């Protein structure tokens, strides 16, 4: 039910506790590095923080947060699981949560899945 | 925020049914019926109010839960348990927890310890 999620650039993605944007630019996945994956219904899930807030695609507008007290939608996503095992996000713009291999903040911004909008991952406590 | 729903391990969602007879775990989707708002009812116990308005009661668990009562008192006090797994389980005032009953037949508050059917993933929606 807890997971993380490894970028393109190796590093896991980070809810960086609320605090601006979400970035793929940790070594290791610990407490901030781990999302309870929520069934939202009809195939769509949610990801909730350590902080217990939940990931939102800001529709594209601003770099990705971990900020939501609720789940609307911005915070569900398509589970898209690609063939090599790896995982990839949609949001509800129909666009790819993309980890920008590390060089700027996670967006959901993209309209297809390339290397930086798969990501490895594992359930892990 | 504090308007949540609940899943049971039968992967379905508590449904309010809109206050007409007992409560389901049968709802595929969570939607207006399966939102329930977390009331602080003192001393660390909660209520849930449903869409309805009214509140969720363990009717004592001499019957199929409700949610009709217009205000709280009780049968309609809940601890409200963090399980080590991540999901929720809901204590009623004869001390039973709160059962999905795997859908099976309507939710109830009768059975004395937390089993497979007696946890919920749980969720804060608008
Ligand atoms: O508590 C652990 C957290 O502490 C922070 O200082 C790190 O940047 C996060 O990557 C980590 O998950
Ligand atoms: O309802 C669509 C979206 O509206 C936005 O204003 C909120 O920030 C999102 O959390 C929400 O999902
Ligand atoms: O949309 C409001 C409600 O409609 C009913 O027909 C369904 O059984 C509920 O699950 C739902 O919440």
């Given at each position: 039910?807890?997971?993380?999620?490894?970028g393109?650039?190796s590093?896991?993605?980070?809810?960086?506790?609320?605090?601006?944007?979400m970035w793929?630019?940790?070594?290791?996945?610990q407490?901030?590095?781990?999302?309870?994956?929520?069934?939202?219904?009809?195939?769509?899930?949610?990801?909730?923080?350590?902080?217990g807030?939940?990931?939102?695609?800001?529709?594209?507008?601003?770099?990705?947060?971990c900020?939501?007290?609720?789940?609307?939608?911005?915070?569900?996503?398509?589970?898209?699981?690609?063939?090599?095992?790896?995982?990839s996000?949609?949001?509800?713009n129909?666009?790819?949560?993309?980890s920008?291999?590390?060089?700027?903040?996670?967006?959901?911004?993209?309209?297809?899945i390339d290397?930086?909008?798969?990501?490895?991952?594992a359930?892990?406590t």
């Open positions: 039910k807890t997971i993380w999620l490894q393109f650039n590093k896991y993605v980070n809810s960086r506790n609320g605090q601006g944007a793929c630019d940790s070594d290791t996945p407490a901030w590095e781990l999302f309870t994956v929520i069934d939202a219904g009809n195939g769509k899930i949610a990801l909730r923080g350590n902080n807030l939940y990931v939102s695609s800001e529709n594209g507008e601003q770099a990705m947060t900020n939501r007290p609720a789940i609307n939608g911005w915070e569900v996503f398509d589970w898209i699981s690609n063939s090599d095992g790896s995982v996000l949609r949001g509800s129909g666009m790819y949560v993309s920008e291999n590390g060089e700027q903040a996670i967006t959901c911004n993209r309209p297809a290397g930086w909008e798969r990501f490895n991952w359930a892990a």
